[PDB]
Symmetry: C3
Subunit: 240 residues, 3 copies
């Protein structure tokens, strides 16, 4: 495995996974690098695919490696620098080089890291595409009154609602179609742990458009792209 990737690219990519886990398996496939992981509680799941085209250079033959993702993140943080990634299959180390700086990261046996989850294909009733700013905002407001967040469609009005109910205060971010990028307004109303949804949203880069798949008392999925399109990230969040 050997690759050369832009600093912002890799940091956006590892940021998504690091929201849920501190160690992960990276699949080093011939035409993309991917990571999929579930958290310990089985409440959140992430699926990253970063196409070969996102790299300035990418060469991989199908291996899998196990990494301390918090260390590897800290390292990628030292970098518009390029980050050079080279695996030593012999010593089981990943060399990361950024200019003259060379960091040798000892791999972890993948068999020792949480089994990769299957993110189930769902046919949830509603689909909402919107600017990430709205999800930031609604999550900030909700956090004021509760640690639970409700995502709800008004199917008639084609309006997406991010809301929460506290002991006496309530909040409601109402997003009719003029504040959306698109909506299929099927029946949808689910409640989630706010903190998970907020950490997730925090990894989404600030100008990204987010796709939300939402039903009634089911998990929510969120999809977005990074690397000008050549990477895609999907989160899935179980309802509470």
């Amino acid at each position: 495995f050997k690759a050369i990737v832009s600093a912002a690219t890799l940091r956006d990519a590892l940021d998504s996974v690091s929201v849920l886990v501190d160690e992960c398996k990276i699949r080093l496939n011939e035409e993309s690098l991917s990571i999929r992981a579930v958290d310990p509680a089985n409440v959140g799941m992430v699926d990253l695919t970063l196409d070969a085209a996102a790299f300035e250079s990418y060469e991989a033959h199908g291996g899998v490696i196990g990494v301390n993702l918090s260390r590897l993140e800290e390292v990628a943080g030292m970098a518009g620098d390029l980050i050079h990634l080279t695996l030593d299959e012999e010593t089981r180390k990943l060399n990361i080089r950024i200019d003259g700086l060379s960091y040798t990261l000892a791999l972890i046996d993948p068999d020792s890291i949480r089994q990769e989850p299957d993110i189930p294909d769902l046919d949830l009733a509603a689909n909402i595409v919107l600017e990430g700013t709205h999800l930031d905002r609604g999550i900030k407001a909700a956090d004021m009154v509760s640690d639970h967040i409700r995502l709800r469609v008004d199917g008639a009005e084609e309006t997406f609602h991010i809301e929460a109910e506290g002991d006496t205060d309530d909040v409601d971010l109402s997003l009719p179609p003029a504040d959306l990028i698109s909506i299929e307004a099927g029946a949808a109303d689910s409640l989630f742990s706010l903190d998970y949804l907020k950490d997730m949203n925090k990894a989404i880069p600030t100008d990204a458009e987010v796709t939300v798949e939402l039903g009634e008392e089911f998990p929510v999925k969120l999809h977005y792209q990074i690397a000008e399109g050549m990477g895609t990230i999907t989160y899935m969040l179980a309802p509470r």
Copy 2:
């Protein structure tokens, strides 16, 4: 009660009160919105007047409501300073597509509102009160405000154990002064926190005496609100 007001106004308005108390009565008046409070130690008092002309729209009709200030503040915090906040009487607060329902409080459940009841008068640029307060704090938790009449000169000063400090503001560094005898000692932390609430460029009027409370006055909302603080002497 129905009012629409700019974010930066309401924030400036609530900040002055928040400095001193966590809840307050807001008197909803026909021509103006007003709050007055005193802290629990009964040492600092604030009096805010928010006139109609500060609200884009403002209709009120004599009521009064009790409010948890921290929360209403955090809510207003959510707007673009440019954004309008819609207030409608629980109090409903809407900002762009965001609506918040804030449960009032029994006004009778709150500390009685004070009324704010001097030889020198000093108008200066808030920036000198910042500096003066910051310097003084390095050396002490008591801060002395003193006029040197002859010299028509305002001093913000403090005496260490080891060290002292003195910010001397003669006429050139003042907006104007009526330099009556005045020399009075205060809790620096009360003055500092009050100061913290004053906007960066506001002009501040200080009334000062000899062993007497100090008052500070300044304007918000480009002129349509007025805030008075009074702080008891030591």
Copy 3:
């Protein structure tokens, strides 16, 4: 005494010493020399008259800093910065001359960078020269991971590449580095299990600071 000094020049001055001790002795020029409670780190600051617009006491150093942050500072302890008047016993080290085998001149950024990377893996930092390749390394070794900022000639200001490889407390090197201005050129003298010295200038080359740090 009486002086009139640039705020930014006097802050960079006092910073280099403040980093090592909370209190100190001030003495053609101004100077301070102190070594830290553990006798491990030392500083020798020298400010030339020309660093001063106009130009032995024993100062409380963290307070002088706090006052200088209110800012030309007039020094007459009595301090004045515009309208601001602040009123604030020396009996209350030998930096050896070494001919350390190596001498490296480099941009400050590099040393920042090497220390930040080393810190992710250890609280010990290694400074090493590769004589052959005239390449300065800043490196660390962890429980399982390693880092090496390798700085060949192309990435240096100068190098006299003697044999040298010494190990140090990263926290003290990191504190020292804190006070060094962001675009300073730093000269390092280095040998084989010996103290390191760092030299840099302030006040436009009007001021010179030396640090020395004992090895581990």
